């Protein structure tokens, strides 16, 4: 945390973006970056869900204490986790993300660039990127730690979360440090 900080907490505690329905980008490449600190066994950390009628989605998730991505742009679900790491302790980590189609690339703070290249023949594009659900409350499994200084395709999610700009929707047990 060296930016516009934001806390997270017990019970119900999840944020919701909502792109303006006529305005749902869909890219070839997605660029997520966000630096957290949790203490929870199972969970969902963040999630862009596309829209209705669309199984395209992108979900960083705290399975087994290993914050690990899982996504379907079209055909099968891809998944880049680093399954060695009890990092879900309260410690702070700056977990970045790259994607060009099926090719993707995770990278926790400074460690190696663990990357997957599903050989099948994946599809290039997300579709109708609509809602960004940071919290996992609406997924069934919640998350209790924090995040900060967010960056996403050049759209600052949590500098704009405190400006209270139009499109944000904040309903949870949460703060600003």
Partner 1 sequence: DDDKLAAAQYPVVNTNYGKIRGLRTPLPNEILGPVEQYLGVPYASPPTGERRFQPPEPPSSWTGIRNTTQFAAVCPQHLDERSLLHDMLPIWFTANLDTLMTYVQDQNEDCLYLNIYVPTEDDIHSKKPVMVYIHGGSYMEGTGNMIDGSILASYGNVIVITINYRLGILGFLSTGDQAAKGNYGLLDQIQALRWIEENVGAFGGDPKRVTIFGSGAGASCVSLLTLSHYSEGLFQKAIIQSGTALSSWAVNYQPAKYTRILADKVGCNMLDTTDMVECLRNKNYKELIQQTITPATYHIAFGPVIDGDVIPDDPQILMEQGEFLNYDIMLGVNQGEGLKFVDGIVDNEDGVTPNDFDFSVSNFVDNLYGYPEGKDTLRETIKFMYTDWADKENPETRRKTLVALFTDHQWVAPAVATADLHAQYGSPTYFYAFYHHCQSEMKPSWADSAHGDEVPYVFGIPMIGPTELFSCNFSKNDVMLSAVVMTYWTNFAKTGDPNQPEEVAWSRYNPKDQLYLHIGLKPRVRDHYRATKVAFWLELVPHLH
Q: Which residues are annotated as a binding site?
A: 56, 73, 125, 127
Give the nearest distance from C-beta 73 to partner 1 in angstroms: 7
Task: For residues 176 and 110, give the distance between their C-alpha atoms in angstroms, rounded to a whole number.
Answer: 26
Sign of the Cα torsion 30, 55, 117, 46 reads: positive
Q: Residue 76 or 109: which CB sits closer to Ca ion?
A: 76
Phi and psi of 116, rounded to 5°?
-120, 150
Task: For residues 27 and 61, give the distance between their C-alpha atoms in angstroms, rounded to a whole number.
Answer: 21
Q: Residue 107 or 129: which CB sits closer to partner 1?
A: 129
Task: For residues 142 and 104, give the distance between their C-alpha atoms in angstroms, rounded to a whole number.
Answer: 25
Pick the binder of Ca ion from 74, 98, 139, 156 (CB under 5 A).
74
122 sits near Ca ion (criterion: CB under 5 A): no
12 sits near partner 1 (criterion: CB under 8 A): no
Pick the binder of partner 1 from 12, 25, 76, 153 (CB under 8 A).
25
| Strand ordering across the sheet containing 32-36 | 115-116, 103-108, 93-100, 32-36, 151-152
Give the nearest distance from C-beta 56 to partner 1 in angstroms: 8
The footprint of partner 1 (CB under 8 A) covers: 22, 24-28, 51, 53-54, 73-74, 123-125, 127-128
């Amino acid at each position: 945390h060296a930016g516009t900080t934001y806390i997270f907490s017990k019970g119900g505690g999840q944020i919701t973006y909502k792109w303006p329905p006529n305005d749902r980008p869909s890219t070839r490449a997605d660029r997520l970056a966000i630096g957290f600190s949790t203490v929870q066994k199972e969970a969902v950390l963040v999630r862009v869900d596309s829209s209705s009628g669309l199984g395209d989605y992108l979900e960083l998730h705290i399975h087994q204490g290993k914050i690990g991505v899982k996504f379907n742009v079209g055909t099968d679900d891809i998944a880049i986790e680093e399954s060695n790491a009890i990092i879900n302790d309260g410690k702070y980590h700056v977990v970045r993300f790259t994607r060009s189609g099926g090719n993707a690339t995770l990278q926790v703070d400074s460690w190696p660039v663990i990357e997957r290249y599903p050989a099948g023949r994946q599809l290039t594009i997300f579709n109708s990127q609509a809602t960004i659900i940071i919290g996992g409350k609406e997924q069934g499994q919640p998350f209790q730690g924090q995040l900060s200084g967010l960056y996403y395709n050049g759209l600052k999610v949590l500098n704009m979360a405190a400006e209270n700009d139009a499109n944000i929707a904040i309903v949870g047990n949460v703060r600003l440090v």
